[PDB]
Amino acid sequence: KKLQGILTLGNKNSGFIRSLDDDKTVYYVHYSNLTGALDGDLVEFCKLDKPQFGDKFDAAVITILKRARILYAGNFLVDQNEFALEYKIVADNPRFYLTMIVNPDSIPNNLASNTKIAFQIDEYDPDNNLCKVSVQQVLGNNDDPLINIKAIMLDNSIVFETNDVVEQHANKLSFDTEEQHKAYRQDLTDLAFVTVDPTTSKDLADAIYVKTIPTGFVLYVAIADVAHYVNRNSEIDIEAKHKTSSIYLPGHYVVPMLPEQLSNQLCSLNPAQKRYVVVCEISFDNQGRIKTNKLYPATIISKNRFSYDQVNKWLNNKSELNCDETVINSLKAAFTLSDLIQAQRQKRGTIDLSHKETEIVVDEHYFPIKINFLVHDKAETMIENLMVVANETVAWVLTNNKIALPYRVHPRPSKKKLQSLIETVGELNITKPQFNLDTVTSSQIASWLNENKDNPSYEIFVILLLRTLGKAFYSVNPLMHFSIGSNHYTHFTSPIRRYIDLTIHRLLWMHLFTPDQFTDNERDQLKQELEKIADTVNDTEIKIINCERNANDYLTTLLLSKQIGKTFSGFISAITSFGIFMRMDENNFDGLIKITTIPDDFFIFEKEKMVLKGRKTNKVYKIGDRLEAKLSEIDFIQKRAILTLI
RNA sequence: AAAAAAAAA
Ligand SMILES: [Mg+2]
């Protein structure tokens, strides 16, 4: 018969097709055999008669079954030649390789050159890779960095435009004063809950209070009661389900999963306002082992809105925070519990995969200024520990009550991927591990990292381990979370900005808090949808991560384009057939050193060790080597910084 | 070129 699979385009816009079969078989397809297909398209293909060159079969596309996109971002150009106007579009995406004939009836008379637009394909000629396109949206000035970020979101299918019906529905909502007197809702408004968040955030989902008892501690994790305001399958909910999460882009810019009157006002646990929450209350003994837990709706008043910067500076006795003594005692008790919890998590097995992370600072016109390294201090570590224990507790409560739910899962990595990792890292003098590769535990990977922290190449070690370990995702099947270290885990603590957390809250309400206010058909309708919700969230998480990486590259190469001629030190992060990727120390960005212009020899890529070796002199470039290199150009088409060795 | 845990965002 005929085969079917998804096309992925890479270097030079050749690529491969991943079949939909059981084996997920991979076939190579050269540019010349794409027959009009674009990156991400689902295609029908045939396997060519020609004998396999090696590695895998080569393929050709027969037809396109379903396009990955309907709109594409691009730059519109107009010029006058003779007495006739000429239109051109240059697609933002370098994998959009078709030559475009612009339908003139789609061009407003007032559309000026160098305007970012979105277009659709009206027709295509598979034999010449030329197509007719129509402008569908005018986005704005092509030189404005914010317009390019919005184009990137559009190119990744990420909704960002205001939805007028949804904003009007959200503006109708208000605080129901009578909800707090419900018998099922515990009044906790006297307790000294507080919030600790980055200084600029206005969506505050979580508040904490920790009390000491003679036998140990009681922790209160209060999470904004989003399900109270957002009814399932309402206009607001449907839009939230489409987004699946809030998006945070550089420089301030947030696309919220929920509109602002909810995300930053009615649900945000803002200081001094009465707010409805769902509380996970956990009592601990003096060893930090969970003794009991209860979940229940409540009312709170946050007493203080703190930043991470404020709490960390207070920790080092440099400055101090203006709050009641009950808050001070809760914060001190929260830190004691958090250090204690951290110790219990390491004992049970948990993999600390921390590494360098960055953010891009932009000015008032969205132009990038500099790159900052992020820190993850005690206060951020403290909140993280309390949020993890609540998430894990809720996962177990729902499982124990036999309620189907979406877990946050992370499977054990395969034996083959680990062995591949082991060989790669031996050239970096990372110890060979002693554990069994089929059975290796979280505890054993953590110990393995530990016996190597002082190695100069520990940073790239963690990078390679992170790729070996792979993606976490959501699943209704009760799979383990290998890197966190638990057999059951979910996302409960952030429903203002993640749709899964909202779903978890709904499950709590419908099965445990007020099952009597819902019918069995409501419970079964949600149960039947869980796997589709997990699928959409997983698919959209990929799009968001790709969107962030596009924006990081666009903004970082735009910033470096003004620093041509500076020399940067760094280390080799990857070796490819077309050259070396070097990660620059000062900005954590990978630049490309093209193979052809490496000095002193002619270098050949050898896939065996993933090195470049010089045909004479035996010079070897390998992953991890320290380098110094010159910034020679910015490739604005592919958004790669190109470097030359010094 | 390829890709990633956790947490607050
Ligand atoms: Mg928070």
d(CA A575, CA A65): 35
Give the method of determination: X-ray
**CA quadruple A204, A205, A210, A216: dihedral, nearest 10:** -150
Tell me, in Å, how far CA of A572 is from C1' of B1? Answer: 13
Q: Which of these, A495, A643, A486, A491, lies nearest to A580 by C-alpha position?
A: A643
Q: Which nucleotide is nearest to A550 (CA to C1')?
A: B3
The residue type found at A104 is: P
Instruction: Return d(Cα A550, Cα A92) in angstroms, integer.
Output: 11
Residue for token digits 């499950």? A507
As a dihedral over the C-alpha atoms of residue A160, residue A467, residue A354, residue A369, rounded to 10 degrees, the angle is: -50
B2 C1' – A198 CA distance, angstroms? 32
The residues spanned by each domain of chain A are: 3-68, 69-141, 142-412+470-564, 413-469, 565-646
Provide the CA A223 to C1' B8 distance, Å, integer: 13
Compute the 3-state secondary structure of chain A and give helix, strand, coil in percent, each to the nearest 5: 30, 30, 35
Which residues of chain A between 345 and 364 are close to nucleic strand B, CB under 7 A? Answer: 351-355, 357
Query: How far is Cα A544 from Cα A508, in angstroms, rounded to an integer?
Result: 28
* Residue A584 CB lies within 7 Å of the nucleic strand B: no
- Determine how many CB atoms are found less than 10 A away from the CB of residue A214: 5
Q: Is the CB of A376 under 7 A from strand B?
A: yes
DSSP A595: G
C1’ B2 / CA A334, Å: 41
| Closest to A41 (Cα-Cα) out of A49, A50, A29 | A29
Rounded CA separation A233/A261 (Å)? 19
Q: What is the spatial distance between Cα A72 and Cα A41, in angstroms, rounded to a whole number?
A: 13
State the nucleotide closest to A489 in CA–C1' terms. Answer: B6
* Residue from A186, A164, A173 nearest A231 by CA: A173
| Cα A203 to chain centroid, rounded | 18
Structure-block tokens of residue A83 = 């007495």
- CA of A592: nearest nucleotide by C1' is B1
Q: Which of residues 515-554 of A touch strand B (CB under 7 A)?
A: 549
* Residue written as token pair 């030359």: A644
Distance CA A226, CA A234 (A): 13
How far is A65 from A68, CA to CA, in rounded Å?
10
Q: How far is CA A16 from CA A38, A132, A196, A599, in A?
A: 11, 26, 46, 32
CA–C1' distance A503–B9 (Å)? 20
The integer distance in angstroms from the CA atom of A146 to the C1' atom of B5 is: 30
Nearest Cα residue to A502 out of A170, A230, A275, A180: A230
Which residue from A518, A516, A501 is spatially nearest to A183, judged by alpha carbons?
A516
Structure tokens at A318: 């440099």
Cβ atoms within 10 A of the Cβ of A67, count?
A: 15
Query: Does any strand B atom come closer than 7 Å to the Cβ of A371?
Result: no
DSSP A332-377: HHHHHHHHHHHHHHHHH---------EEEEE-TTS-EEEEEE----
Cα dist. A128→A34, A87, A92, A97 in Å? 11, 19, 21, 11
Rounded to 10 degrees, the C-alpha dihedral A380/A381/A382/A388 comes to: 110
> In DSSP terms, which residues pair with A416 in a beta bridge?
none
Cβ atoms within 10 Å, residue A220: 23
Q: At what angle do helices A325-348 and A378-400 cross, to 10 degrees?
A: 70
Relative to beta strand A130-141, strand A99-102 is parallel
Distance between first and last Cα of chain A: 55
Q: Beta partners for A118?
A: A73, A137
The alpha carbon of residue A573 and the mean position of all alpha carbons in its chain are separated, in whole angstroms, by: 21
Kindly give the distance from the C-alpha atom of residue A207 to the centroid of ligand 1, in angstroms, as a whole number: 7
The strand ranges marked E within A566-625 are 567-576, 579-584, 590-594, 603-606, 611-614, 620-622
A617 backbone dihedrals φ, ψ, rounded to 5°: 80, -15
Q: Residue A417: in which H helix or E strand, if any?
A: helix A415-426
Q: How far is CA A193 from CA A97, A161, A353, A593, in A?
A: 56, 35, 30, 53
The residue whose CA lies nearest the C1' of nucleotide B6 is A484
Tokens of A185: 């809702």
The nucleotide lying nearest A470 (C-alpha to C1') is B4
Bridging pattern class, strands A216-224 and A206-213: antiparallel
**What phi and psi values does residue A552 have, to the nearest 5 degrees?**
-60, -40
Residue type at A470?
A: G
- CA A569 to chain CA mean position, Å: 28
Backbone angles phi, psi at A4, to 5 degrees: -145, 140
Q: Is the CB of A484 under 7 A from strand B?
A: yes
Contact A215, A507 (CB under 8 A): no
Long-range contacts (CB closer than 8 Å, 24 or more residues apart) made by A346-349: A346/A446, A348/A443, A348/A485, A349/A441, A349/A442, A349/A443, A349/A444, A349/A446, A349/A485
Residue with tokens 């603590």: A493
Kindly give the distance from the C-alpha atom of residue A638 to the centroid of ligand 1, in angstroms, as a whole number.
36
How buried is A241 (Cβ within 10 angstroms: 0-12 exposed, 13-18 middle, 19+ buried)? buried
Query: Is the CB of A497 less than 7 A from some atom of nucleic acid strand B?
Result: yes
Closest CA to A139 of A67, A85, A89, A84: A89
Please state whether strand B lies within 7 Å of residue A636 at its CB atom.
no
Q: CA at A197, C1' at B9: how many angstroms apart?
A: 8
Q: Which amino acid is at A138?
A: V
Query: From CA A73, how far away is CA A39, in angstroms rounded?
Result: 14
**Residue whose entry in the numeric block shows the structure tokens 């001190």:** A332
User: A245: which residues sit within 8 A by CB, 6+ positions away?
Assistant: A257, A497, A498, A499, A537, A540, A541, A544
For the record, the structure tokens of A21 come out as: 């079969």
Residue A274 parent element (H or E): strand A274-285
Find and list the nucleotides of strand B having atoms within 7 Å of a protein beta carbon: 1-9
Smallest CA-to-CA distance from A299 within A182, A437, A417 is with A182
Are residues A3 and A19 in contact, defined by beta-carbon separation less than 8 angstroms? Answer: yes
Q: With a 7 Å cutoff on the CB, does A46 touch strand B?
A: no
Asked whether A493 and A501 are in contact (CB, 8 A), the reply is: yes
User: Which DSSP state fits A522?
Assistant: H
Residues 405-464 of A with CB under 7 A from strand B: 408, 410, 463
SS (H, E, C) A74-122: EEEEEEEECCEEEEEEEECCCCCCCEEEECHHHCCCCCCCCEEEEEEEE
Q: How far is the CA of A484 from the C1' of B5 (A)?
A: 7
How does strand A368-373 pair with strand A358-362?
Answer: antiparallel
Q: Is the CB of A492 under 7 A from strand B?
A: no
Measure, in angstroms, how far nucleotide B4 C1' is from residue A456 CA: 21
Alpha-carbon distances of A5 from A23, A25, A60, A517, rounded to whole Å:
12, 9, 11, 46
Question: In chain A, which residues from 244 to 273 place their CB closer than 7 Å to nucleic acid strand B?
Answer: 246, 248, 254
A573 touches strand B (CB under 7 A): yes
Query: Radius of gyration over alpha carbons of chain A, in Å?
Result: 27
* CA A437 – CA A435 distance, rounded (Å): 6
Q: What are phi and psi of A369, to 5 degrees?
A: -105, -50
- DSSP characters over A180-241: GG-TTSEE-TTS--BEEE-TT-----EEEEEEEETTEEEEEEEEE-HHHHS-TTSHHHHHHH
- For the beta carbon of residue A639, count every other beta carbon within 10 angstroms: 19
- Measured distance CA(A57)–CA(A5) in Å, rounded: 14
User: Measured between alpha carbons, how far is A20 from A627 in angstroms, rounded to an integer?
Assistant: 42
A100 touches strand B (CB under 7 A): no
Give CB contacts under 8 A, 24+ apart, made by A417-424: A417/A468, A417/A470, A418/A468, A420/A468, A421/A464, A421/A465, A421/A468, A424/A464, A424/A610, A424/A623
Tell me the C-alpha distance between A473 and A411, whole Å: 9
Phi, psi (deg, nearest 5) at residue A317: 55, 20
CA of A544 and C1' of B7: distance in angstroms? Answer: 18
Residues near A32 by beta carbon (within 8 Å), at least 6 away in sequence: none
- Rounded distance, CA A628 to CA A620, Å? 16
Tell me which residue has tokens 């919005």.
A150
Give the CA distances from residue A90 to residues A78, A119, A120, A158, A491, in Å, rounded to whole numbers and listed in that order.
12, 11, 13, 21, 41
Kindly tell me the number of DSSP H helices and DSSP E strands found in chain A: 13, 31
For every residue of A435-461, DSSP letters joined together read: S-TTT--HHHHHHHHHTTTTSTTHHHH
Q: What's the Å distance between residue A570 CA and nucleotide B1 C1'? A: 18
Query: Which one, of A51, A49, A56, lies nearest residue A29 by Cα?
Result: A56
Distance A310 CA to ligand 1 centre (A): 14
Residue A590 CB lies within 7 Å of the nucleic strand B: yes
Which amino acid is present at A19? Answer: S
Adjacency order of strands within the sheet including A290-301: A186-187, A290-301, A274-285, A216-224, A206-213
- Tracing tokens 């306002």 back to the chain, one arrives at A273
Do the beta carbons of residue A15 and residue A9 sit within 8 Å?
A: yes
DSSP state of A426: H
Residue A391 CA, nucleotide B6 C1', distance (Å): 12
